[PDB]
C-alpha cells in the first residue's frame, strides 16, 4: 500500500533537474533497488569503489543497467528500454534518498554474516579464521556522525560470539558489508513507529543521508 | 556435561561443611539452576535482605531456605534434611552455582526488565506510554574494573533506541529479567566460547557474579 514514505520520495525526486518522464523511471528503479537488498548492496559497492558499470537482474523486477561516467561527472540509467542521463551529484542524491526512505532496516539483535572480502584484512585475520563465517550482531542503527549530525552510518555491530567487551570494540559498517542475514531480532509496532519517525521522517527533514553517498 | 558436574562438585570444596551437607547442597543447586525463575526469586530475596524462600516447582520435594541475618547463617531444608551454612558460605555456594550451572542468554536476545529494580527516572518514559521496559543483550558476564575480580551478568541497550551516543547502555543483574521475548542466535561456536570463557576460565580465576559479594 502507498504510504507516507512514497510522498517524501516523490519530494526528493522533485529536487532532481530532470524531466517528469525520467523522474518516473528513476522512481521505479529506486523502488526495485529497495525491494532487492542484494541488488542495492551491489550498486552501493560500485558507487563506493568508483566502478563504472552496474548490471543486475534479480528474481523480482527487470534488468537494471547503470554506466557511471566518472570522468564526465554524469551517469546513465536504463530500465525498460528507457535511458536517463543524470549528473553525478543528482545520481548520488537520488540513491541517497532511495536508501534513506525505502531501504529496510534490520531489527536490533539481528545476527548477520559480513562479507570478509570487504572487511579490512587485519580484522579478518585477528577476529576470524578460515571456514568460519564472520558473524555479527546489530547493536545500533543509522547512527549520527560527528557533532553536526549531517550523515549517518547504517549499523554498529559486535563480533559474534564475543559481543561488547572492554577488549573487543564494536564495528561501524555500511549496509553493503552484509553478506547474509541469519536470524532477525525482535521487532514490533513500537520499533516500526520509531524507525519511521526518527530514521526516515526526521532525517529527511534535516537532509541526513548515509555517509557512503557524499552528496 | 559430566565435566561441568565435576567442576560444580569441586566448587563445593570451597565451603566449610561436612561431606553429607555438600551432597544436599549439590542437589538443591542443580534444582535452582534448572528453574531460572525460582533462582531469580532467591537472588532477589538475597539482594533485598529478605528472610524466607520456598519453592515447590520440583516434582519430588519442596525447598525452604531461611536467612538468619542476625545470626549470620542460613538454613537450607531439602527432603526433610537440614544444612546450616554461614552467610559467607551461602553466598559462595550460590555464586558458584550461578557461575557454573545458570543458563546464559544468546547475544541479541530481547528481554523485558523489572521496572521496580530500575532507577525511577529511567522508566518514566516507558510508563508514560504504558509500554514495558524492553532491552537487548549486548554483552554477557562482563568484567568489573579495575580489579576484574567479579562479573556483571548483562550489558543491555534500551529498545527500540539501541546502542547510541545519546543513550548509554545499562548494566543489569540476571534477577532484573522479567521475561525473555525472543532469544538471539546461538550455535556450537557460542556454546564452546561460553563454557571455556564464562565458566571454566572464570572458575579457575575465582570470578563470580557481583551480586553475591564474596
Ligand atoms: Cl546517534
Ligand atoms: Cl562533522
Ligand atoms: Cl565487537
Ligand atoms: Cl542504550
Automatic annotation (TrEMBL), chain A:
It holds the Pfam family DUF4176. This is DUF4176 domain-containing protein. It comes from Streptococcus intermedius B196.
